[PDB]
Amino acid sequence: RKKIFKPEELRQALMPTLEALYRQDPESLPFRQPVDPQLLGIPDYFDIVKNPMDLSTIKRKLDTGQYQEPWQYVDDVWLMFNNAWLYNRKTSRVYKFCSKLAEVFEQEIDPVMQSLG
Ligand SMILES: CC(=O)c1cn(CC(=O)N2CCC[C@H](C(=O)O)C2)c2ccccc12
Ligand SMILES: [Mg+2]
What's 43's domain CATH number? 1.20.920.10
Find out whether the beta carbon of 40 lies less than 6 Å from any atom of ligand 1. Answer: yes
State the structure-solving technique.
X-ray
In contact, 87 and 48? CB cutoff 8 Å:
yes
Specify the DSSP class assigned to residue 67.
-
Q: Which domain holds residue 116?
A: 1-117
Q: How far is CA 26 from CA 12, 32, 38, 59, in A?
A: 25, 11, 23, 19
Q: Which amino acid is at 109?
A: I
Query: Does 79 contact ligand 1 (Cβ within 6 A)?
Result: no
Q: Give the count of domains, the chain.
A: 1
* Cβ(92)–Cβ(55) below 8 Å: no
Q: Are 55 and 21 in contact (CB under 8 A)?
A: yes
| Cis peptide upstream of residue 30 (ω within 30 degrees of 0) | no
Q: d(Cα 82, Cα 78) in Å, to the nearest integer?
A: 6
Resolution in angstroms for this experimental structure?
Answer: 1.6
CB atoms within 10 A of CB 65: 12
User: HSE on the CB side for 53, CA within 13 Å?
Assistant: 20
Tell me, in angstroms, the distance from the centre of ligand 1 to residue 16's CA. Answer: 23
Please give the Cα distance from 110 to 113 (Å, whole number).
5
- Which positions ≥6 away from 116 have C-beta within 8 Å? 5, 10, 13, 70
